[PDB]
Amino acid sequence: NYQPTPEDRFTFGLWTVGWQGRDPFGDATRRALDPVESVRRLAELGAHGVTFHDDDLIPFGSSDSEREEHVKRFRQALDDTGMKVPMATTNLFTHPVFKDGGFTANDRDVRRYALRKTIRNIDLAVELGAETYVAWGGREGAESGGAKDVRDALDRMKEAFDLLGEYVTSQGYDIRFAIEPKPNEPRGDILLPTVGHALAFIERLERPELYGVNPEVGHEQMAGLNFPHGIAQALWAGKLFHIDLNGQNGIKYDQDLRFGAGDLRAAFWLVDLLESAGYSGPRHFDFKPPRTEDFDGVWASAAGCMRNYLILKERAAAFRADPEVQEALRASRLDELARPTAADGLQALLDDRSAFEEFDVDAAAARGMAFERLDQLAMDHLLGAR
Amino acid sequence: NYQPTPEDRFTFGLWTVGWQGRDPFGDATRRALDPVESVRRLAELGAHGVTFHDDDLIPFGSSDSEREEHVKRFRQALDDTGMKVPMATTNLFTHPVFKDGGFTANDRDVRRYALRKTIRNIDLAVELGAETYVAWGGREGAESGGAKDVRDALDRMKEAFDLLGEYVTSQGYDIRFAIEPKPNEPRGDILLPTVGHALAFIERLERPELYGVNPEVGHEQMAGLNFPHGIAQALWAGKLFHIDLNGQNGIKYDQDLRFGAGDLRAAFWLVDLLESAGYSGPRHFDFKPPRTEDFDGVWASAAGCMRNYLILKERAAAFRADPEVQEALRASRLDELARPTAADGLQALLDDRSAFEEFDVDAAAARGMAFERLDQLAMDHLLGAR
Amino acid sequence: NYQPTPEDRFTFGLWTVGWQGRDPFGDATRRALDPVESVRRLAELGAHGVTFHDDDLIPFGSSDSEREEHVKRFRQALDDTGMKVPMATTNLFTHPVFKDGGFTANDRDVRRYALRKTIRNIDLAVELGAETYVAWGGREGAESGGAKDVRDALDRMKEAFDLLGEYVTSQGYDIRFAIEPKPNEPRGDILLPTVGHALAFIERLERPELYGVNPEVGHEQMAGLNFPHGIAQALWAGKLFHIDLNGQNGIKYDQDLRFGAGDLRAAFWLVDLLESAGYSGPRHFDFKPPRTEDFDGVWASAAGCMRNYLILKERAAAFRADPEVQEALRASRLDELARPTAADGLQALLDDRSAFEEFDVDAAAARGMAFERLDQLAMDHLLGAR
Amino acid sequence: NYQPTPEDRFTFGLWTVGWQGRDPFGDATRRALDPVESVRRLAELGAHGVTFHDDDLIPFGSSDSEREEHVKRFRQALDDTGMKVPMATTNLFTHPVFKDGGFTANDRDVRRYALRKTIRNIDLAVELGAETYVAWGGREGAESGGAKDVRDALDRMKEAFDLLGEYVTSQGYDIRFAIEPKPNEPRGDILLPTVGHALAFIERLERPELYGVNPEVGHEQMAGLNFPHGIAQALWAGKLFHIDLNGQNGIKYDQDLRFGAGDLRAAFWLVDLLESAGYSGPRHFDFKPPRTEDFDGVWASAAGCMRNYLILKERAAAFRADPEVQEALRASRLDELARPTAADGLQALLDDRSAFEEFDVDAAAARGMAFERLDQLAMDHLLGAR
Ligand SMILES: OC[C@H]1O[C@@H](O)[C@H](O)[C@@H](O)[C@@H]1O
Ligand SMILES: OC[C@H]1O[C@@H](O)[C@H](O)[C@@H](O)[C@@H]1O
Ligand SMILES: OC[C@H]1O[C@@H](O)[C@H](O)[C@@H](O)[C@@H]1O
Ligand SMILES: OC[C@H]1O[C@@H](O)[C@H](O)[C@@H](O)[C@@H]1O
Ligand SMILES: [Mg+2]
Ligand SMILES: [Mg+2]
Ligand SMILES: [Mg+2]
Ligand SMILES: [Mg+2]
Ligand SMILES: [Mn+2]
Ligand SMILES: [Mn+2]
Numbered sequence A, B, C, D: 001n002y003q004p005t006p007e008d009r010f011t012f013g014l015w016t017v018g019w020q021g022r023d024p025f026g027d028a029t030r031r032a033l034d035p036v037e038s039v040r041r042l043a044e045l046g047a048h049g050v051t052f053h054d055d056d057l058i059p060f061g062s063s064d065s066e067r068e069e070h071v072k073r074f075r076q077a078l079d080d081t082g083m084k085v086p087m088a089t090t091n092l093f094t095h096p097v098f099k100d101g102g103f104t105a106n107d108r109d110v111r112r113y114a115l116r117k118t119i120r121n122i123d124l125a126v127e128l129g130a131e132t133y134v135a136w137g138g139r140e141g142a143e144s145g146g147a148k149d150v151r152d153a154l155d156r157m158k159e160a161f162d163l164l165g166e167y168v169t170s171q172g173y174d175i176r177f178a179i180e181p182k183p184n185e186p187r188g189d190i191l192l193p194t195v196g197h198a199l200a201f202i203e204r205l206e207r208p209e210l211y212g213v214n215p216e217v218g219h220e221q222m223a224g225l226n227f228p229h230g231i232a233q234a235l236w237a238g239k240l241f242h243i244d245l246n247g248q249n250g251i252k253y254d255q256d257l258r259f260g261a262g263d264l265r266a267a268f269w270l271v272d273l274l275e276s277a278g279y280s281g282p283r284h285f286d287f288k289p290p291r292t293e294d295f296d297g298v299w300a301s302a303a304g305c306m307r308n309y310l311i312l313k314e315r316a317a318a319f320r321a322d323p324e325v326q327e328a329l330r331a332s333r334l335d336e337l338a339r340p341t342a343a344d345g346l347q348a349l350l351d352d353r354s355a356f357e358e359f360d361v362d363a364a365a366a367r368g369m370a371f372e373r374l375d376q377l378a379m380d381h382l383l384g385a386r
């Protein structure tokens, strides 16, 4: 039951199952994983593919020789398993050089280095088959108000993203970029803190069609925001290039729980939306098996990610397929929401006395929305109580 | 000391000093204010102007005759005082008809009525001199996931804003629109929940140049976001058409405290930014004198709004004018942030060995940002301790 | 399926289904309910009982004559239905006189009036069968730091609660008091903001055995706290006299959604705890049918409260009864948690070399907690996926 | 100006200025500090004393020989400088063995080891002069609901604290214990999450007089709580044995900014309260110089902690000493708050017709609290604008 297969397009970062358990207040609880072993164990679990930071796959400061050997080993594991690599990203946050940012570090030479580090890994990503290249500006921001001129920082952020878009255009690459928003941590406030801010920023770039968002469940929830709503707006803009799935219990540090944990009802409505809208990108899990777990718990946690997606997928499908739910949706006028407000046009609206002068405001106010009955049908399906 | 004058461009909504003190758990503590008295008392305090909802100025359901009388009284008060009306807005939230929204109500006839209600008040706003027309979609959203198809809702929201833009274009009006974001309350989640989401949505409108944001201090803070950062991004996009100033203590219900209360340091950095960037729009206070206050406390609270702006203005000016602060800004490389990252171009960057192969990553990592010394200079100025 | 009966001990406040829908930004969407009709409709739904504020049952400012008539009507409805009244409370928040508090108002005469208002309703509560009298100090607090000396306020709060305890002792009443904590709203910060603060305060009262807590799901979640954990600590202290069940989506205004909505997984673990610990008090729903709903939606929402409790009750029971879950609990050493740490005593511990000098810290560190596998068993049961 | 001296009782943890800058997403940006150098540099800055975890002073796993040498070096630095050690604590969180807790780990042998680790360091603390021994149960809690039986966990927590109290009683030590609450991080939820929960738990211990709280500014703010209010309640209970001062910007990860940053107005009201109540314990800074800083920034940040306390101390003193503020406090009836509500007694209250039957509720409701004018006087003083 609920066994994942590659058609489900489930993917995992090397850094997820490979997280050793170091947190602000504690040392590693698990040994480091060989990327080759992760590719194999994930393939056995039914995953579609893997993702990586440059520094997950090639240890930082590697010579050309060692770099080659790490990449060759990895590609062989991908060949043995048929695992794909739909997305890759740059580590612009771990090394102390990035303590004030990469693309928006106050130090100009760091910003140039950030771009060269990213461009090198774009080449490798394209070679391995990645269709999306993710930017998470985890270090772009400040802890204090005077440390960062944010208009200048956004100048530098636009400049970097424009340069990356000129680079892929000059190479004839098909890869597109996806910004992964996060409101805070490790910086006190991070630039482009939500899906909305990232989408707005993209529209000021030179080639906006090359850039979308990679929203993460837990990150929008760290701002108390409704993650299905933000995904809906990303889909509405045509910008949902990729997505990070995990769990988060409210407004606190970034938990990265396995998907399904945290806000379970939001996970249900998210899966309902992704499936209904026909999202066809990777279902990527950016999660961390809690450091309480040994290696067997790591793989159980990763399996649980896919399992919870597939259960929720079945619950939302049954919900939508239920005639009683279809009738409830009509009773709540979800169908009227889809009708143009005034396709008859502005002048017809202005002359339409039934829209104002003769609008019976009180009869319309008295019509109950029947939202609670519909939500309890949704709850009944989610819990299997139908 | 710190006495406001009309050149300071301080404005107040009729609904602010006129808030009677009804909250979810209690009845009104103050009698209703005559708009004419508010215009006069505000003018005596040194305010530049007033704003209004349609239903603040004309009681809902007013005949043409009574409407005329309410407007004539109001204009006379504006003539006696020289008070301006730089902004107006529509009440699309109080009446029970709007319980599921205005522009995005599931009921199509409510959406049409919403638009006719707004268009009527745009005409009056333009007549009274308003340069900005604000939309706060306080009822646009949901408490439960199935109640609102958010992609369809954004269709309807775009349709309404496009119709309003066609209307002002057809009338030859100069007025522009500003979306006021709010993440939640009174709906469980509100559509376009932050400055970022509103800015992104604007770029999908037919005439994006007609639309900006009216961000509110407390609303971005209800999402835990950095309000000066969001204002910076609005300024960066050229979209800061208007601004709502008040106070908010963290993530909870919308407090609307007088400006300066709540997050005092954020208020300092906000005033520093507005003044430094040369923002020239109204400094509008969307606040509520707490219901603990009688009428004398109402006017003291409103005076306190302007007073705190002017103190903070002086502190930020002294901060920026301090040679020790100018030197600290250089020590933190705020000037390098303003320099293009790679004006020499992509190819020069790719061939620049000092940007990667020969970049001494560790020497750069060892350079301290000196952010704490700069922030303590900012703290010293804010507190008058220099 | 999942039909509630009076043995389930489900109770509702008159103010819950009777909420007319007035919120900070909107007028009532529903007509007022006759308390007699609420008693009957709730009895038909399978509820065990009702609760009330004094001013829900007798309109404020009622003469003795009218008061008598309102009470007689109500008791007759209770006689016709067999509905019980296990809890009552005082409205010390709606009337403008309480704008700075009841028991801790700065004005001494208001504090005395608060106590007389409460004592009058204790008499009625005792007559109607109430075993618990709830205090919600919704107005006790401040919006600004200088407005309330909090040590003096706690003096006054202790004085009032001591006086109430002397009153019930002098009358020979069996009724006990329960403090309902709330962190904020309508005050900027409310005194005794969480279960913990309320429990600590009780231990300074003259007769601590007369006082417990009435924790509310949404209120602890408004502080981002774990509601099952706080309930566990209340049970551990022997102080869970009563409980308020509802839903809340994170840190924002007090939503009072129907129970089961909001944090669904927390609702599961709460029901699991209440049932496992053998809590036998009322399962009281302090919720508000959203103002989008008409009267049919009001009763559907109230039914949904009980329904979700009973589904979750069945899921947690099946979870606990599962042999695979019992084995998982042993694998995670939940049984070792129940064993005394050092029943051999301090001196034996000090001389036990296996507890320090010879403790193999690394072998113990390597033992995985197997928490993820256990939680995925819990998730499987909650969703019906076993 | 604002130069700290030892009479100000400012203290710092070795782990504060000694924080190397490793965070969840990045490596250390600073070399490790020798505790002897920290003692000296802090003494030069005007600090009163230092605190430590066992593992800050003696590296984990040290032989008796090396342990002795580390302690001797440290005591010599304390002798050269006259620096005191008013508080010490145990590291029960860094080592992987504590991944599920110390005192409440599910594994019984870990709980015993936790206690032996703590008891060893109590001996050293007492020797060095510590009057308070702090327990921060950072690992006590869970990420998932089934992992921790919280009633059993509180049993184990009581058992451990009782054993520690029996140990100090058996040794004739004067040292007292202080629980440092934290709501979350590194566990998803931490047991005893706030000051209130810790105070309540203490009252169930065998010897409650031996236990108080060590509240931290940022930790209560991570729950959105009012830190001055919680301190007031701790003072009211007689339990403010110690205090941790720092800065935090709202509900997010534990920032540990230098004191004064974060919520500046809350810092003002906190200093006002501590000074007014005559708190005489250490003013301890549990903060982390941001990892953006080099060693010079570390000492500037630490100096800034004391500096901001002393500025705020002067502002609050001037506020309280202002005749205009004294008059405002009377206008807001802060003096009436201090008067007993009903020292005439219950029966006199019951027979007092002026407290109910003849209480003019509307005249009392119409009396404005004048809170805004008082708060603007407080704001004026804080900003130096008087
Ligand atoms: O850079 C991309 C990735 O970096 C990871 O280390 C972070 O945990 C993620 O937020 C992000 O998806
Ligand atoms: O509609 C515009 C205005 O409506 C007011 O009632 C709300 O309080 C504000 O958020 C908003 O500025
Ligand atoms: O006074 C007791 C009750 O008052 C109600 O109006 C509030 O909504 C509840 O928080 C509380 O249970
Ligand atoms: O154990 C006591 C101390 O441990 C430190 O590592 C934590 O940062 C503090 O929260 C605490 O004061
Ligand atoms: Mg991610
Ligand atoms: Mg506003
Ligand atoms: Mg309640
Ligand atoms: Mg601490
Ligand atoms: Mn994350
Ligand atoms: Mn607001």
Ligand SMILES: [Mn+2]
Binding pocket: C216, C218, C219, C254, C255, C256, C286
């Ligand atoms: Mn509530």
Ligand SMILES: [Mn+2]
Binding pocket: D216, D218, D219, D254, D255, D256, D286
């Ligand atoms: Mn901390």
